[PDB]
Amino acid sequence: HWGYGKHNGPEHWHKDFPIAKGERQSPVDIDTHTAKYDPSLKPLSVSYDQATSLRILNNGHAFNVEFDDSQDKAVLKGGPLDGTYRLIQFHFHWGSLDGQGSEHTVDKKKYAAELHLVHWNTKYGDFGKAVQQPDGLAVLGIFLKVGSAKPGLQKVVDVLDSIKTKGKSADFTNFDPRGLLPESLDYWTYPGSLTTPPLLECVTWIVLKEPISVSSEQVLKFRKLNFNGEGEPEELMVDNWRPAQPLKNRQIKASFK
Amino acid sequence: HWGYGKHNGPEHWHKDFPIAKGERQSPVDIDTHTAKYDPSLKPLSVSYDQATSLRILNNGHAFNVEFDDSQDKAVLKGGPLDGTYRLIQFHFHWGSLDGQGSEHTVDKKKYAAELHLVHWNTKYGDFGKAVQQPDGLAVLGIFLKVGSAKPGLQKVVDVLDSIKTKGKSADFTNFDPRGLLPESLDYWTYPGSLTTPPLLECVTWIVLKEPISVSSEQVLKFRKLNFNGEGEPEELMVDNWRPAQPLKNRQIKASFK
Ligand SMILES: Nc1cc(Cl)c(S(N)(=O)=O)cc1S(N)(=O)=O
Ligand SMILES: Nc1cc(Cl)c(S(N)(=O)=O)cc1S(N)(=O)=O
Ligand SMILES: [Zn+2]
Ligand SMILES: [Zn+2]
């Protein structure tokens, strides 16, 4: 029964998931002056041309847009990564107000929301096996700020009415995640973890420097979702972000000067 | 985006909810000289000894005090009712000034506010199924006039600061709704509807004749609530009442002579 409230939120998670106090937890604050440029990092390769989305699900804390990951259709490669990582799902974290919502921060700046594109390393065969490995996942993180609308996001926001409450799903085919990417692929990278329970330390984080812009009306529709099931008292799905965790013995690398 | 303003208030609701012009809409004016005494009505049975409140919520138009309705703990029976109705929530409607705020009127008299205790018929299993039935709900309505304070109301007014804006909730356990009841259970009854969208024609209305008294300071605290979300321009939550609707082919019955 973990969640984001006073009695079950991030400060409680360590009781059920002791790794919450581990050595490579996420998210973190990105200190842009301390991050070091690494000229040995390769360009990021984001190959989403054959992506095939299947479904969208309200899982009780956010919503996941799911993909067919049974062949290499949508893959992340290059950058800090060795080998091939297949897209399985994306989701967001967001706030109750525009001044908060992101998980990562940039010189302590919080964005209104953060998009996570989750990928698993094909050398481990399946997602479930991959999360047991220190290099099992690669998450592409993208900040959202409020300003102009993101056209490529509108098909997501218009389906949210149909998955308002916990446990609802809807068909969501033919969704192109390329419409959620900023112009630049300039990034920061560090070794970390899932930001939700079970908090497994299996993620290579790749956080893009350039935010995308979404409109106030688009993020308002996120905030009309519900944490609760149908027929239960309404609890708006807002503030589903974990705050920054201690960097400990890690270095954040920059792909750019 | 229905509400109570000039451009989205009760006179607009029929566009989205055509039943607003239906044959059994609420509230109504209670013409006390036309209501007929029915000696075949049984005494009302209000059994609230085991009620267990859980939470209070600002839903953007009023606030709801919610109950655990997963067993028969707080039930309404008798009167005009067949079977057992379980308490799910209560809320109020109120005005900007003491001369208005009630939904029902009594010989055209408007009270400062009106309390609605909402109950669903256990034969339909859940609230959501109950509102689809002509005998699905029973609402106990109680008028508020301004005079002496209502001691049993003060725990509600003191929590309102913590739910000032739309979408906020707070724990609200151990609240006894018996402290909101007048001495007499003398009532009027008629078949009607929800008074808010979706305006479903599923309610047996039971309106008590005896008002309760609340102090000016108590109703002032209702009027400090906000329709708006946090960080938005302030719009005081006042005048959240629907005016009287046409009686059409209905009879109001009185439990008393
Ligand atoms: N399965 C999963 C995997 C990752 Cl990697 C992440 S996150 N937030 O670390 O990207 C979140 C989730 S989920 N669906 O529990 O929110
Ligand atoms: N759910 C509900 C049920 C009833 Cl019955 C009524 S009322 N005003 O008819 O009592 C009001 C509401 S609510 N929460 O939308 O204001
Ligand atoms: Zn995430
Ligand atoms: Zn009401």
Domains and CATH numbers, chain B: 1-257 (3.10.200.10)
Q: Which residues of chain B lie closer than 8 angstroms to A97, CB-CB?
A: 230-231
The β-bridge relationship of strands A253-254 and A187-192 is antiparallel
Integer Cα distance of B156 and B187 in angstroms = 25
- Asked whether the beta carbons of A237 and A171 are under 8 A apart, the reply is no
The tokens for A12 are 């409680």
Residues 6+ apart with CB under 8 A from A41: A79, A80, A189, A253, A255
Q: Ligand 1 centroid to A245 CA: how many Å? A: 16
Integer Cα distance of A256 and B116 in angstroms = 62
Cα nearest neighbour of B171 on chain A: A6
Q: Closest by alpha carbon to A165, among A60, A257, A74, A85?
A: A60
Integer Cα distance of B112 and B102 in angstroms = 6
Q: Closest by alpha carbon to A61, among A88, A81, A91?
A: A91
Q: Closest by alpha carbon to A190, among A74, A100, A104?
A: A104
B237 by DSSP, 3-state: which?
Answer: coil
Integer Cα distance of B1 and B98 in angstroms = 27
- Asked whether the beta carbons of A167 and A60 are under 8 A apart, the reply is yes
Integer Cα distance of B250 and B136 in angstroms = 18
Q: Ligand 1 centroid to A86 CA: how many Å? A: 14
Q: How many helices (H) and strands (E) does chain B have?
A: 3, 15
Tell me if chain A has a CB within 8 Å of the CB of B88: no
- Asked whether the beta carbons of B92 and B212 are under 8 A apart, the reply is no
Residues 6+ apart with CB under 8 A from A46: A76, A140, A181, A185
The tokens for A109 are 């700046």
The closest CB to that of A236, out of B64, B128, B167, belongs to B167
Integer Cα distance of B250 and B253 in angstroms = 10
| Residue labelled with tokens 């209070």 | B56
Measured at the alpha carbon of residue A53, what is the angle toward residues A50 and A59, in degrees to the nearest 5?
A: 150
Measured at the alpha carbon of residue B204, what is the angle toward residues B200 and B209, in degrees to the nearest 5?
A: 125
Tell me if chain A has a CB within 8 Å of the CB of B39: no
DSSP annotation of B109 reads B
Among protein residues, the one whose CA lies closest to atom 8 of ligand 2: B195
Cα nearest neighbour of A237 on chain B: B167
Integer Cα distance of B9 and B26 in angstroms = 15
- Asked whether the beta carbons of A81 and A43 are under 8 A apart, the reply is no
**What's phi and psi for B234, nearest 5 deg?**
-75, 130
Tell me if chain B has a CB within 8 Å of the CB of A161: no
Q: Closest by alpha carbon to B128, among B180, B188, B200?
A: B200
- Asked whether the beta carbons of B251 and B31 are under 8 A apart, the reply is no
Q: Closest by alpha carbon to B26, among B8, B10, B12?
A: B10
Q: How was this structure determined?
A: X-ray
Cβ contact, residue pair B126, A236, below 8 Å: no
